[PDB]
């Protein structure tokens, strides 16, 4: 659908509704939000992905 | 004349220092430094790991 049409506010209905479109089921969120969950991710993983050796002192 | 049954030598260093003569001991120091750069041999260059 999302490629035929160009409008961009269809995703997945949860609580059941005939009707995927958001436009009608009351949904907004912050782009500050959004944006965050992709930054914080892609920065963290180039770390993740770096360390070769890994050395845990036992306590 | 002696004062007891028998008299143990004396170790001229203290009980517990450990001492090494010949090339051994300069290849171990050598070996010590290659195990320490075996850590940072694949972090070097802008496409290394932390």
Same mark, same amino acid.
């Given at each position: ?9 269809? =995703?997945?209905?949860? &609580?059941?509704? =005939? ?5 009608? &089921? ?12 992709? &930054?914080?991710?892609?920065? &963290? ?12 002192? =036992?306590? | 004349?002696?004062? @007891? ?9 203290? +009980? @517990? ?20 750069? +075996? ?8 496409? @290394?790991?932390?």
């Amino acid at each position: 659908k999302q490629l035929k049409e160009k409008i961009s506010n269809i =995703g997945v209905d949860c &609580l059941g509704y =005939g009707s995927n479109d958001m436009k009608e &089921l009351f949904v907004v969120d912050p782009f500050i939000g959004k944006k965050q969950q992709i &930054l914080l991710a892609t920065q &963290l993983c180039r770390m993740i992905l770096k360390i070769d050796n890994v050395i845990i002192s =036992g306590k | 004349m002696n004062f @007891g049954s028998q008299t143990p030598t004396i170790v001229v260093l203290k +009980e @517990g220092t450990d001492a090494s003569q010949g090339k051994g001991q300069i290849i171990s120091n050598i070996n010590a430094c290659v195990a320490v750069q +075996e850590a940072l041999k694949p972090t070097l260059g802008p496409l @290394g790991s932390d």
